[PDB]
Symmetry: C3
Subunit: 255 residues, 3 copies
């Protein structure tokens, strides 16, 4: 069953939407959000009727940081024993394409959540940052890894060491976001994008996303070989036949 305390979930067509729902805390991420979001994403992933997954917050904040109260008295013993934050890894293991729709504050864990998704659509109001340094820690949800890989060392060092924010426009030309859309149009644009992707062959889309993810896990030489073999294997799927046949017959595919 799909009822959660900190999030809302809507299934429409082949698109699933995970809305962060903690207005009282500006959508701050806590242990329960981690567990609810990953559980939801995972269920949507196993659902053969779902072809794209959106993660979003409110117009005010995608997710403005984390509950510092959960972390405040945590010791290294509790941290190592619980493997604090490791559960977020379950989001990255989702095979179906994911879309972060980001309005307002995407800070700390919030910025890192956005970066875990495959596609990142931002409102013009979106503000990205990693202020963990200010709290005497550092990013714990992959920020030092994905940010640096997206925007380059100079900018990632700047944000992570000073804690400054980056607005939608800068994020777009720096490599962080896919596209910037007007604040009022965010949810509509994200659903439109999610629709397009969810209407692709589920198999082909899963493979493409997988191939892209390899670009960060090995040398180019190995990524090229992996992509080529995956490509070869797609010719064993019926969706490639239907897809190419649809192209020839100049029609919509029926996967």
């Amino acid at each position: 069953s799909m009822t959660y305390e900190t999030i809302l979930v809507e299934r429409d067509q082949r698109v699933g939407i995970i809305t962060l729902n903690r207005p009282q805390a500006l959508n701050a991420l806590n242990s329960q959000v981690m567990n609810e979001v990953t559980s939801a994403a995972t269920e949507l992933d196993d659902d053969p009727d779902i072809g794209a997954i959106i993660i979003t917050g409110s117009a005010k904040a995608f997710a403005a940081g984390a509950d510092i109260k959960e972390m405040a008295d945590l010791t290294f013993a509790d941290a190592f024993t619980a493997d604090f934050f490791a559960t977020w890894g379950k989001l990255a293991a989702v095979r179906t394409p994911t879309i972060a729709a980001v309005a307002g504050y995407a800070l700390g864990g919030g910025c890192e959540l956005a970066m875990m998704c495959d596609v990142l659509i931002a409102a013009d109001t979106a503000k990205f940052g990693q202020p963990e340094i200010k709290l005497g820690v550092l990013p714990g949800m992959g920020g030092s890894q994905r940010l640096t890989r997206a925007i380059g060392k100079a900018k990632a060092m700047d944000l992570i060491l000073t804690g400054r924010t980056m607005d939608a426009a800068e994020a777009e030309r720096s490599g962080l976001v896919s596209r910037v859309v007007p604040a009022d149009d965010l949810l509509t644009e994200a659903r439109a994008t999610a629709t397009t992707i969810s209407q692709m062959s589920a198999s082909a889309a899963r493979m493409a996303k997988e191939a892209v993810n390899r670009a960060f896990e090995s040398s180019l030489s190995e990524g090229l070989l992996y992509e080529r073999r995956l490509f070869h294997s797609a010719f064993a799927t019926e969706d490639q036949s239907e897809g190419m046949a649809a192209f020839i017959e100049k029609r919509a595919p029926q996967f």
Copy 2:
């Protein structure tokens, strides 16, 4: 010397390979693949060539791939032939290569452009990977090279939705070296090719090889490799010449 799908011109120390299938918008197929790599190799081995341009028409650099060769392809066939692997001969070219890209560079075409070292784009250039729409995925390194060029967010967007990207976006995203007016594309490409071909051959070959290392190993290994190459250059006449010329406040004469 005579090719069915391409034209080859030599001008001084610059070789130019021009895709030549107007009737098909310079779409790639097995023949184009065999001919381009055959021509490029041959130019690579010619001591009187120091730079190679690959270009298409003003409307299409290469508008995609031939759907015919893929429509009834089985996994067994693709695996046995190692379909597309031959494009790897282009990467093995030691001499610097310049893709001069006008108009359409889609699917395989976009991938062809990404294989070159330098990419000069007409202001008319459109890039994209529409493989997903046909129920397959990039098979010529697109998911590897695009992602490394322009970051995850935008590569995922392009590869999963098939959306096009104009020349200006490509320039600020990391995909292209420079954007020039369409009428000036070929002229500008030859100027660049001329410049590169008049550098020391061995030094340009070491420089290209070093840059290529950046995608094949850790930074600490890449650093060691570059430094060793750099040291090696001191066993060439061209380094002594180039450095004497700076000190003597003159133009170098590489031989």
Copy 3:
């Protein structure tokens, strides 16, 4: 220590290294390499320093490594000395470094800037890797750091042609953190340095190190490394203080 080629000053928790060969536009010779790395190491080891700035004159950050010194090299001198390897000492510096670049940052100068964590550019700054055309190639990590920063197409362009990149192009390409007016460069860098040095020293060191991992291994390994480092920060006083301060809406007192 007394230095012949640099100037060092300490102010609060900020150390500043000024390249001081004005007669050679701060060309980077072996003596500069040794002194900069010695000064940086000394500053790194001083518990009263929390950030380090490296800068040149308003006319040049550094206009290449010293060509006169290099003309005097055989392959044997270079291999035996492991020419340029000592610059690695600067990468071993745990404390955050900020390159404040005005005017010329060419070859070794551009490379030195890229070695630093944060890069602040005057609007007047010019970047380049013109080593080619001395009949050599970058020897201080240029082929590695530039390529990872700005993508293949532009790094090949710059490295094979020797063309210059203005500060504005560098900022949108991935090379620089921020661009500021030439008159405000030293002021802006000091502000950034101050911000960074007033952070928890251990947090900053961890964060910087985490970010540096993004170039040394796969994403999955970088992710794990970060999380372990994040857990270990909960064994530090500063984590406890940094977070208690935030909850209590006050200013942190790091020890």
